Design a binder for this molecule. Sequence first.
Ligand SMILES: CCn1c(-c2cc(N3CCN(C4CC4)CC3)cnc2[C@H](C)OC)c2c3cc(ccc31)-c1csc(n1)C[C@H](NC(=O)[C@H]1[C@@H]3COC[C@@H]31)C(=O)N1CCC[C@H](N1)C(=O)OCC(C)(C)C2
Ligand SMILES: Nc1nc2c(ncn2[C@@H]2O[C@H](COP(=O)(O)OP(=O)(O)NP(=O)(O)O)[C@@H](O)[C@H]2O)c(=O)[nH]1
Ligand SMILES: [Mg+2]
Lengths: 163, 170
Amino acid sequence: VNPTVFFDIAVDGEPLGRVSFELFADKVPKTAENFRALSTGEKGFGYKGSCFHRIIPGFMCQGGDFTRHNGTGGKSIYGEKFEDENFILKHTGPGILSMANAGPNTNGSQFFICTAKTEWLDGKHVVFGKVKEGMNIVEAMERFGSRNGKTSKKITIADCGQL
Amino acid sequence: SMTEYKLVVVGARGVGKSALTIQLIQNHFVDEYDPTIEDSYRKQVVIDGETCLLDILDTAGQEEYSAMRDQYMRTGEGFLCVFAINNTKSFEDIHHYREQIKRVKDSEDVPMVLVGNKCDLPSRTVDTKQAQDLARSYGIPFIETSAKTRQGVDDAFYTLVREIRKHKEK
Ligand SMILES: CCn1c(-c2cc(N3CCN(C4CC4)CC3)cnc2[C@H](C)OC)c2c3cc(ccc31)-c1csc(n1)C[C@H](NC(=O)[C@H]1[C@@H]3COC[C@@H]31)C(=O)N1CCC[C@H](N1)C(=O)OCC(C)(C)C2
Ligand SMILES: Nc1nc2c(ncn2[C@@H]2O[C@H](COP(=O)(O)OP(=O)(O)NP(=O)(O)O)[C@@H](O)[C@H]2O)c(=O)[nH]1
Ligand SMILES: [Mg+2]
């Protein structure tokens, strides 16, 4: 069975709501396991307390920099970065969960949640999950974004874990 | 009142477009790489004894979006064309940016400055003569810069303003 994880989202420290994700361990086990472990914090580090630093309405919400908290950082459970596992799954629509990167084989911890189909990212970003519950929370996050992604309020993962 | 100049910083990803702009505006540098979506800044300066307002567009070098540059190229008045002196591919990318700018603005006379950035680094792969020769073939200035040491930062932007002034007073 594919694991499911949750984020409790907060806006300037005020709770907004919970988003849950199915992680496609049946197709991308290494990538799903990284996200799962970072969501539980079981390695001593992970997503709890980190923010969504880039939110672009019409496109995606991006987060996961828990090392520097400025969009430049993050790290995986395997080392600073790990390879692109496969590109079997595509960016088919809102709710897709996919890895951010800085080019081939640079997956760390940063990720993005699609709010639209982003097919030109197919074959460049590893898709590894999708929103299960709480898509309305992701939609509610979009109004805190902007054209270039800078956010107007601090959007954080106040808590996270495995269900 | 003071004149505003619309400067656009272009070049391959990672060459230092943002670091140069941030050195100009904020007087600092960090080794961390925060890739640009699109950023805009304003700064007043004095150039040749004349106060003016720089409107600077810091563009994405991410090549997958190369089809999305026409509008900012039409709007921009002058272009800082940046490569890194340790990255030959970014120097090769310069020709394509210049040809794109000329094609979009439909002119052979577009204010531009060629900027060889990262001159603090020992691993140089693009000779100074190689870049000077290209800039001469383009009819534009060439300036070597380091966003890390601040070498040439003011000079690169101020020179681009001077180029725009010549074009407007032609
Ligand atoms: C040209 C402007 N522009 C656009 C864009 C494009 C479009 N289209 C393209 C598609 N067309 C259809 C075919 C017809 C329609 C018009 C419209 N309007 C826009 C924006 C709003 O105009 C301002 C984008 C976009 C993306 C980048 C740069 C400029 C961009 C960019 C820079 S770096 C990167 N992308 C990958 C990035 N890397 C890092 O963050 C590294 C940090 C350090 O190391 C770890 C971590 C990363 O993984 N992601 C995770 C994935 C989404 C991605 N960010 C991101 O933000 O995409 C933003 C956006 C809006 C989706 C795309
Ligand atoms: N040593 C040195 N490093 C530099 C210099 N300019 C930029 N860098 C480094 O090069 C990396 C990329 O710089 P950045 O300014 O983000 O480049 P960019 O052209 O804006 N990239 P993008 O097109 O993705 O926005 C960063 O790690 C930055 O610290 C420089 O003059 N010297
Ligand atoms: Mg930049």
